[PDB]
Amino acid sequence: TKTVFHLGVTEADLNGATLAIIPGDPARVQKIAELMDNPVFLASHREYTVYRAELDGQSVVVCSTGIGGPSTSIAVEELAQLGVRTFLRVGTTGAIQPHVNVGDMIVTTGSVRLDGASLHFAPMEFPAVPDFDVATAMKAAAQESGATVHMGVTASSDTFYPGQERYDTFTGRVVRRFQGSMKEWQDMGVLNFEMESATLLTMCASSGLKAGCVAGVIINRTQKEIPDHATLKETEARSIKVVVEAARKMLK
Amino acid sequence: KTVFHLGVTEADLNGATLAIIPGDPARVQKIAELMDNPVFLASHREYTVYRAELDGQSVVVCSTGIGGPSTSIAVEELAQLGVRTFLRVGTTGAIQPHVNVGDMIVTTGSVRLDGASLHFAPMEFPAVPDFDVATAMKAAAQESGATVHMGVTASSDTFYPGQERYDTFTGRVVRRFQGSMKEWQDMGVLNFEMESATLLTMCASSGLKAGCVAGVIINRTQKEIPDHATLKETEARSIKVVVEAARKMLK
Amino acid sequence: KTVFHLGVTEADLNGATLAIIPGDPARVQKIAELMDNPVFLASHREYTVYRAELDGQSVVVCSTGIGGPSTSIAVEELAQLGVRTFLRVGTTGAIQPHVNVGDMIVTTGSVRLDGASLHFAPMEFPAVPDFDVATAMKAAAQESGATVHMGVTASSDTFYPGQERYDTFTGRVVRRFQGSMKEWQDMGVLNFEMESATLLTMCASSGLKAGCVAGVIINRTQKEIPDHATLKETEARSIKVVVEAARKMLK
Amino acid sequence: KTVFHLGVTEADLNGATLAIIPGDPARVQKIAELMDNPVFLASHREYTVYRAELDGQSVVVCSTGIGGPSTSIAVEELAQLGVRTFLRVGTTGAIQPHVNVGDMIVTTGSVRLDGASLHFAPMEFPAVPDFDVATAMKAAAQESGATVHMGVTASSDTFYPGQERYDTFTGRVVRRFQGSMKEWQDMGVLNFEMESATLLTMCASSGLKAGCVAGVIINRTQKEIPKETEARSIKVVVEAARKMLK
Amino acid sequence: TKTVFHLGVTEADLNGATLAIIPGDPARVQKIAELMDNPVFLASHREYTVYRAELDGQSVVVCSTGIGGPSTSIAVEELAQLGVRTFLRVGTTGAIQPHVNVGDMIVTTGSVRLDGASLHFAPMEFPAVPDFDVATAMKAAAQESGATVHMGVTASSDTFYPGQERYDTFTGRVVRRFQGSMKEWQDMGVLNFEMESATLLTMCASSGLKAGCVAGVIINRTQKEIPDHATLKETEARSIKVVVEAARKMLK
Amino acid sequence: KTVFHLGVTEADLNGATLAIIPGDPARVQKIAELMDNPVFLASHREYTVYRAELDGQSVVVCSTGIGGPSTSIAVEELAQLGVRTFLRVGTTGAIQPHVNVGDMIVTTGSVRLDGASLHFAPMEFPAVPDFDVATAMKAAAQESGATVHMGVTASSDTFYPGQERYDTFTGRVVRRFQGSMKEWQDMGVLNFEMESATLLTMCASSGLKAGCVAGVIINRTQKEIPDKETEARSIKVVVEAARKMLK
Ligand SMILES: [Mg+2]
Ligand SMILES: [Mg+2]
Ligand code: NA
Ligand code: NA
Ligand code: NA
Ligand code: NA
Ligand code: NA
Ligand code: NA
Ligand code: NA
Ligand code: NA
Ligand code: NA
Ligand code: NA
Ligand code: NA
């Protein structure tokens, strides 16, 4: 049986799946899988929890990535070794534009590469861009849920704190590179911050894999950092329903 | 109030908020004549400017010249005069064996092998089209009956060393570009051209909507040589497609 | 108080100012149980947190996940809760023929093949441990009877191309990393891992004390699949060593 | 063979080894008519090409368009056809208060604020003219009676943000270029234009002789947006060409 | 048999020395050598003055480097060609931290690479770090002298003026890269500026050579208290006493 | 007021506004003695300083040591004391087969393979000489009867790997510099040395006039390590170039 170093699954375990839904949080894996048919737990090791399920009769993998490009790059590579070719990222995000409201959804059309792992696949000049079919399916699924949907650029940072220009920290300092950066991205039309899309999109677009990202907005950095619990719960539930419908459209 | 290089005023554009931007000044009139009431506005340097009407709405056609620098001037000055949507059209060579002469490429992102893009956003920023423009271009290209490829384009400030051409005066390619064509091929890049990184980066970071569509007229991975009829048909299809994409963008 | 990700409060740490930070959440309980009164505090995402007591002093054990990004969150949030000293423990792959499986490595500096270190200091800044922590780790490792190497570690944001692995889906390694393992070997680099550049740069530029100790589980010049009993012995020794290094840091 | 963009053959050039390269295609005939027997060769895109004779020797005049990319095509294709010396003439905006409109500038080196230069040499390489060309341009400019400055030119891939112009659609300039005009002024840079970094780097790294001479049409300490001094500039470049051909 | 090109010495001249003490100033070479047994002048060319001496019966070289990484890189290379494997840098320095006092000693644990020559040996990602044994010996020797010792990061600049953010200069200008840089390094915990350690440490750590740096503090830019003649002469003398004792510990 | 490193005052320079700056302190007296009334001013570290008179005007001669860092100190401190024109003289290794031992090179621009230039101007800025100085150096070199080349010089922070030398302790050259000699040769670069990028960038961005002239002592197409007429000719040329710069 062909094995992988980290994910603890074999190709046979995936029952022919060529599409994976890849949340960051291992606890979200079962929640996504149960929206599909016959969900089965496969493995859990480190930040990687893996389930299989069936969508319109076709096998689909759900696999967490952990936070950050490095752990994401391992999961994507090992799933690709086992036959996966399409990767649908789902999560929640913090918007930086005043016109993007908490509870809206964002489909990334390109990422600002504020990461390191993307450079291990392509030099900085290469665009961190989704597959067009995936982005199209995500937009359609997000609109069909009734959400307000934004298509646009996402800033993808290797840190939660200084690289997103947060000052409420142990040192209260932000290195020169990132001082004033939130305003710069705002002025350039960037919609939101997250921590994995630059790696995911660059890796996949340079390796013959299809990828995209969809996210529900849980905070707006121009407003407040502490989300309201009921609003957050509704946004999380809608986001995973949307990504499953986007997967259905990709497997049509 | 006349913009410095293009030699037109806002009133000359008759309310147009969309421009079709070919590189070659001689193609401007040909595109304008696919629409209604084409009117010559100005010609200076590489910038020939026409207006026309598409479903009753004014549209500008303006050439850019070769390269990001001359393109950046045209986009800026058109934006000063109210243009918000920019549709690049042209023909191109492909670098993938599965892309055939006569197919169409709609760029989903560009490798920034240029300098002017950096005058608008740092290198980390993606040279990506507006999603509505890319969607309209894909639809128009597919409705034409052509085979359409969505993917990455390598956008070079040179025709020769930055496209790893060795049939040159020196035969030299600087270290940065040695082996680069195979690298881009292995990364799935569809084609080289010379303006999209500047155009897409400038527009995506400035509140403007842009995209690129091109007909494939040569493939340097293929031994077969296309004939004159196929090349003429491809050039003609490329501009018919961009006009239909403009139609889809009108509100 | 409250932190965004770790789900613990300052009160939960019972005055701890030192943390042992493995990568794998499953190792946290194993480390905590080498000390007195281990208490499970929280588990969320890749972050499992325990407290224990070492010579009567509270110590926190907190996993980081794989990579600089998740590590940077844990270190920041622990620092918000009063932690000032961070002891990284784990297993590693050596790249030097003279470093044997079962040896231990204490990092004296890291090659910054990551992105998160740049969010704390520009590339010119050295990814260097605190001298007291490195000294304590060397002493603990040597006192255990292990063969110990002090030297430079290459710290990569990827497991695959950034460590020049070719047995992959594409079999390709980007130009930057082609030939890189031989380059690091020739420069005397001991091993690869994926968190030290971020950890050491963040701490050395932020007034925090950090170091890294690791047991060698593979040698890249030999084989990729480790022998089970040898690996188990090395893992057990590594966490015993880091606990003794923590003992040496207590004041 | 006929080169891909310029539409001319080696035979069309009648043995010319020197080219004068203005940016604007409309200036090509104006330069050519200052010499003997000017003949139109071709026009395609931004490239208009004439041949003429100077002291009995064939000379090419070929426009480049705006920017390093289109310039790099013209220089390469002319070099394929035997041209070895390239004399750039154009206009420029001064950034030093003491340089006045109508003055002339001969570039001794360019700040590489372009992309195409990097397709010929890494950034460490100097964007420097051939010393004989720079010497001939200085002499020709002095002999015309103009006030001449030798010095460094900032060569930008954009007209707007890379020259720190703010009267624009966005009114914004990216971090790299904020405060850059003052920085170049403090470093003694004389002027801005858009082709010299590409031209000089490409030629100095490829065995070709190049230089640039320009007329000041605006002082950027005064404002952002701008016949004797266009006419004088092309008279000067033709005299510089005469000095280069023995 | 060969005579090295710049230093003008042969391997036989070194009488088997495998350790060198490398001050910057040629006039300090004899002062260091005379702290050991049987000091003998070997050669002087340009900024390179070379002596041999004996320490606990073992031959030791003392060789000046001149100011800056470039001239240092020549001396280290040519000594390595002649069998030298351990390099102990000694000098005096300013400090940029308020808690570092005149008369204290700094042992460098890593250097900020604000130089060019380090890049001729390893790319910027590589750490400018000392050999651990050398740093340990220098700490012990410095403590045994009675001085207060600081272990930490040093900023190593190719210039004395703009790269140390000095404005009292001919132009009064500091290029963008270095504006605000002193405060940045101070906030990052950097102890001091000097002009050779990044080159020395990077070259040696990437070439199989052991190196370290120790320096006595003779001025503090954050304090406007002028130390007197006595404390400065004492600090220079202590610095070289310390480096010789560190050499003794390396040869034990 | 005495500058920090050079050990001289403004009064010591007797109104000199031009300096000849060799690398080797032992060459300072030799250059000064080619002029009238040479006077030893100071020696400390790699900095030996003399004054002399050339056609009645005071000229300084000051060594720089090897490398951009020590050069940048000397140039700055001389500028603090009123010097505005800096004439670098020295030896060099040619990398073009048509340049012979004994020829002279006047640098028209330098490849910035150094670090100190970046402390004065970002990498995009050209390491170029003042045109008057380069013109005076070309004229002095040609009037001497020498074969003179104008062109680009590669200016390296190291003697060994940055000049792609392999007869070294490690026998290795870092990726950046592997194949670099051939690359510079193909790009028409004439020679290697170690100070011009710093000197020219510093001066061109600081309102100071600088240039470099050098005699060729080795051709790197022949061998790696060099093996007196040329040294003497080079300093005679730089003194005559100084004469041409005097106003
Ligand atoms: Mg406005
Ligand atoms: Mg050897
Ligand atoms: Na992780
Ligand atoms: Na709102
Ligand atoms: Na090569
Ligand atoms: Na947009
Ligand atoms: Na390769
Ligand atoms: Na153009
Ligand atoms: Na700013
Ligand atoms: Na020196
Ligand atoms: Na340059
Ligand atoms: Na190599
Ligand atoms: Na100047």
PDB file of N, CA and C and ligand atoms in Angstrom, chain F residues 166-171, ligand 2:
ATOM      1  N   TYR F 166      39.507  29.901  -7.333  1.00  0.00           N
ATOM      2  CA  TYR F 166      39.320  28.567  -6.777  1.00  0.00           C
ATOM      3  C   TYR F 166      40.544  28.009  -6.071  1.00  0.00           C
ATOM      4  N   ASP F 167      41.712  28.638  -6.208  1.00  0.00           N
ATOM      5  CA  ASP F 167      42.914  28.134  -5.540  1.00  0.00           C
ATOM      6  C   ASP F 167      42.935  28.652  -4.102  1.00  0.00           C
ATOM      7  N   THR F 168      42.011  28.116  -3.306  1.00  0.00           N
ATOM      8  CA  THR F 168      41.698  28.651  -1.991  1.00  0.00           C
ATOM      9  C   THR F 168      41.561  27.503  -1.003  1.00  0.00           C
ATOM     10  N   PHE F 169      41.380  27.865   0.265  1.00  0.00           N
ATOM     11  CA  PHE F 169      41.232  26.863   1.314  1.00  0.00           C
ATOM     12  C   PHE F 169      40.053  25.929   1.050  1.00  0.00           C
ATOM     13  N   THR F 170      38.871  26.478   0.747  1.00  0.00           N
ATOM     14  CA  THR F 170      37.741  25.589   0.486  1.00  0.00           C
ATOM     15  C   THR F 170      37.671  25.124  -0.957  1.00  0.00           C
ATOM     16  N   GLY F 171      38.253  25.870  -1.893  1.00  0.00           N
ATOM     17  CA  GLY F 171      38.130  25.517  -3.292  1.00  0.00           C
ATOM     18  C   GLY F 171      36.724  25.615  -3.821  1.00  0.00           C
TER      19      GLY F 171
HETATM   20 MG    MG G   2      42.198  22.179  -1.184  1.00  0.00          MG
END
